[PDB]
C-alpha cells in the first residue's frame, strides 16, 4: 500500500467566462493534500515552440466520494511550491477504494 | 441444558447505519449501493460467531436454560458469561405444575464464571423427572454503545469481512479479528469429574 | 438404527431469494429466475453436508429412527441433535402389528446429548425380531429465521462455493465455513464398550 | 461370493437433465452443446467410483450374493450398505435343486453393518458344494431425488470433472468430493478372524 | 477469481429511429449489475475540441448466454450515479465461462 | 468482581483532530469533518484494545468494582492498573442497605501492583450474601496530553491501521505496536493458590 | 511505587529544528512541508520509546518515587538510571505530615544501579502506612546538546521512523536503533529474593 510522503496544494480554476465563450482561469488554491509522487520514463517533448520536457508522474492521493472537494478532478491540478503537476486521470488505484492514481506531466520549458 | 433463546435480537438495536459507516465512510466509492437489509444480515452472522467462539452475548437477550439435574452441588456455572438478574428459577415437574422458587439462591455475577450458587449448601433440588428451568437475561447493555469497543470492532472486522468477500475464498494483522477476542474467551482447564 | 426422514424440507423454506442476495447476481433484470432451479439445488446440497459434519438439522423435518436393539440398557442417545416432542416410540412386533407404547419414556433435550432416557429403569422391552421406531422431530425451527445465524452464514459460505466452482478445483478465512461449523459438530472421546 | 448386478440402472432413473443443469446453469456459454449420452456415461462413471469408495448403492438396484459358506455362526453382514427387504435367500444344491426358504431369517436393516441374522444360532446351513445364494433389493431409493443430497452433490462434483477434463490431468475444497464421501464410507477396524 | 463488489446501473438504449435513418438513443436504465472495475494507465486524450480524459477500466461482470437480459452487450453502457462507463467489448474472461471482462473508457470531459 | 465503568470517556477528551494530522487526511479543505464520526470510533476502537492487552486505562474515568469474596485475606489488588484516590468501598448488605466504610482500608499504590491492603489485618467483612462494590477512578490523567506518549503512540499506530484496512486482510517495526505495549502488560508468573 | 513525573519537558528543550534537518537536510524535496507540531509529537514518542527500553531519561526531568517499603535494608536501586542530586527525602505519614530528612543517606551517583545507600545500617524507616517519598532529578542534561550522541541518534533514527510511515507496515542495519540501545538497556541477572 502507497507510502504517503509529500505536501501537494492541490488548485482548481475558478472559471470566469468572458464574451466570446472561454473561461478565464485563475487558479486559486485548494487544501492540501498527502501524496506520493512515483516518477515515470522522462524525455523532451516538442511542444508548440518550446522543447518541454516531460515525466510521467504517476501520483497517488487517498479517496473520496466524487461530489467531494479532496476527489482531484482532471480539471485541477497539483503544485509542489512552483512545479506544476498538472493531471490527466483519476484511476481509483485499489480494489477496495482506499486509493486513487493520477496522473501527470510536470512540463519544464528546459 | 437446552438453553434456547426467548426473543432474539428487534434488528434496530444493531448498528447498521454505523455499520454502513465502518464499511466506506471517509474513503471509498461514496456511500455506494448496499442491500440494507442485507448488511443487518452480516452483523448477525458476524456477533453469532463471536457469541460462540467468546461465550458472551452482546445485545442483553433473553435466555432460557432448562436442564435436568444439577452438576454440583450448589454452584451451577451459567454458561453465557456477562449476566445480570435471574428472571426466575422456576421448576417445572414431570407433569408441567411449573412452581417457582424465590429465595435460597443468590445469583454472583462475574465476567469469568456466573454462578447460582445457593445459600448454605441447599440448592433447589430437582422433581425427578421434572427439569429445573432458569430465565435470565445475559449481555452488556440493551444498545450497541454500552459494549466494549474492542469487542465490537471484531464484529466490525468480521462482518466486512462477510461482506467483502462471499465464498471462502484466501486472502496476520497485530489485532485482527482473533487478537481481539482472545480476551473475552472463556479460560477453562478442566477435563475432570468436578 | 436406521434414521431416515419422514418428510424432506419444503423448498419453500428455503432462504432461495436471500441466498441470491449473497451471492451478487442482479437487481432489477426482468428475468430473475433463470437460476431458481439451481440456486436450491446447491442449498440442499450445503445443509446437507453441514447437517453431517455437524450432526445438527437446522429445518425440523420429521425423522424416523428405526431401531432393533438398545445400545445402553435405558439411555438410547439420538443421532440428530437438536430434539424437541418425541411423538411416538410406536413399538413394532416380529411381523405385523405396530402398538404405540406411552411406556413411561422420557425425553432430555440437549444440543449434545438428546437422550430418550427411561423412567422405570428399563426402557419398553423389544419384541425378539421386531424393530422399535421412533418418530420425532429434530431440528432448530420451522423456518429460516429461527436458526443459529453462524450456522446459516456456514450454509452461505459453502453453497456460493458450489455456486462459483462446479468441478473440484482447489483454490484461510479467520471464520471460514469450517471454524463456523466446529461449535456444533459433536466432540466425543469414547470408543469403549459402554 | 461373486455379487453380480442382477439388473443395472435404466438410464432414465439418472438426472441427465439435472446434470446438464449442474454443468452449466444460471452463468455459462449457453445451455451450449453436450453429447447427450455422453453426459450419461460420466454420471454412471461418478456412481460407480462413489458405489465402490463408499460401498452404498444409490439408486436401488436389484442384487445376488452368492457365496459358499457363511462367514459367522449366524451374522452374515451384507457389504452393499443401504438395504431394504431381502428378495430370496433361495438355497441351491450342488446340482441345482434351488430349494428356497422362507422363514428362520430376520434381514436387520442398517446404514452401517446390515446383517442377515437368523433366529437363535441356527442359520440355513449349506449343502455342500451346494453355495447358498441372496437376492436383495439395495439403495436409498428409486428416483434420484430419494438420495441424500450431499451425497448427490459428491456424484455432481465428480461426474463434472470427467466431463471438464479428459485424460488425467493435474489441477483442496473445504467440502470436496473427498470431504462429501468420509461420511458414508465404511469404517471398520477389524483384520482378525472373526 | 474476481472480488465484485461495485454496484454498475446497466443501461441500454431503445433506439427509436428517425426519418434520415439514424435512430435516437434514450438510455433508459436496465438492471443493475455487481462487478468488479480495475483501472487501467490513464491519460487524457484528444476529442474533437474537448481535451477528454480516459482511463481503460476493464470491468468483470459475471456470464450469461448471449440471448439473456445480463449479458451486457458493447452495445450498452455502465453507470454508477453519473459517471458512464462505455462498453467496448465483452469477451468472457473466465476459462469455465463464469466471469466476463468488458472494456470501458470513462471519458470525463476535464 | 465485575469491574464496570460509572462513566465513560467524553470522547471531547480524545484526540481526534491530532489522530487527523497523523493519518495525512489533507490541510485547507473547506470540508474537513466528514471523518469525525468514524475517527473516534477507531480511537476508542484502538484504546479498548490496548486497555485489555495491558491491563492500563488511559483516560482516568471512574470505575465500579463488585466483588463478593476478598481474592486474599487482606490484599486486594485491583485489575486495572494506574489508580489514584479510591472513593468509596460501600459495602452493600445481602439485600438493599448501602453503608459506605471508612473501615481502615490503605490504598497502595503502583502501576503494577495497585493493592488496595488493610491495616487492621482484616479488610471490613462481607454480608454473606451481599456484595463489596468499590468505586475507584483508575488511569494516567484527565486530557491527553498526560499519557505516557509511547503508549499514546500505540494508539495512533494501531487506531491508523484500523483506518486504513477495514477487514481482517494480513498485510516488523523495530517499535511497532506490540513493542511499546509490552512494557506497560502485567507480568505474572503465579497460577498457585496464594 | 509510583513514579510519576513532576513536569514533562517543556517542547522547547526537543530539538525539533534538528529533527527537520535530519529528516530531510542536504538531501531531499526541499525542506518541504512538515507540520512542525507533528514533528515534536513523534519525538516525544521516540523518547519514551528509548526511555522505557533503557530506564533512562535523556532530558533530566523532575521525579517523585514514592514508596510504601524499603527493599534492600539499606540499599534502594533507583530506576531512572543516570541521576544526580536527590530534590528531597521527604517522609509523609498515614495522616500526612510530611516530614522531611535531611541526613542519613548518601546518594551513589552511577549511570549503572543509582542508590540511596544510608550511612552504615539504618536507612530512614517508614511510619506504618505513611509511604517514603523521594523526589530527585534524573536524566543527563537539561538542553539536547549534552546527551551521548549515540543515544540520540536512536531517537533520530526511530523519530524518523514514525514519521515516514505512519500505521504497522513491514519493510537490519548494522547499527539500527536496536543496536544503538543495546549498551545503554539495563542488564540485570536476579530474579532472586533479593
Known sequence: ?110 | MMLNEVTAVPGTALPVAEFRDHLRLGTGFADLGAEDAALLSYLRAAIAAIEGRTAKALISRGFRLALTAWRWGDMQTLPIAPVATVTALRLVDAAGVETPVAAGWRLVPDMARPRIEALGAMLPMIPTGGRVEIDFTAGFGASWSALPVDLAQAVFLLAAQYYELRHDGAAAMPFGVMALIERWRTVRVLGGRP
Do not use: M
Open chain 1, 1 to 110: 500500500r502507497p507510502r504517503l510522503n509529500r505536501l501537494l496544494v492541490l488548485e482548481e480554476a475558478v472559471r470566469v467566462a468572458d464574451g466570446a465563450g472561454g473561461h478565464r482561469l485563475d487558479w486559486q488554491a485548494k487544501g492540501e493534500v498527502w501524496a506520493e509522487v512515483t516518477a515515470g520514463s522522462g524525455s523532451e517533448r516538442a511542444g508548440e515552440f518550446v522543447t518541454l520536457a516531460s515525466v510521467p508522474f504517476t501520483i497517488v492521493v487517498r479517496a473520496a466520494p466524487v461530489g467531494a472537494a479532496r476527489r482531484p478532478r482532471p480539471e485541477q491540478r497539483f503544485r509542489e511550491g512552483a512545479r506544476i503537476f498538472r493531471i490527466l486521470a483519476v484511476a481509483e488505484r485499489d480494489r477496495e477504494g482506499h486509493y486513487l492514481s493520477c496522473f501527470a506531466r510536470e512540463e519544464v520549458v528546459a
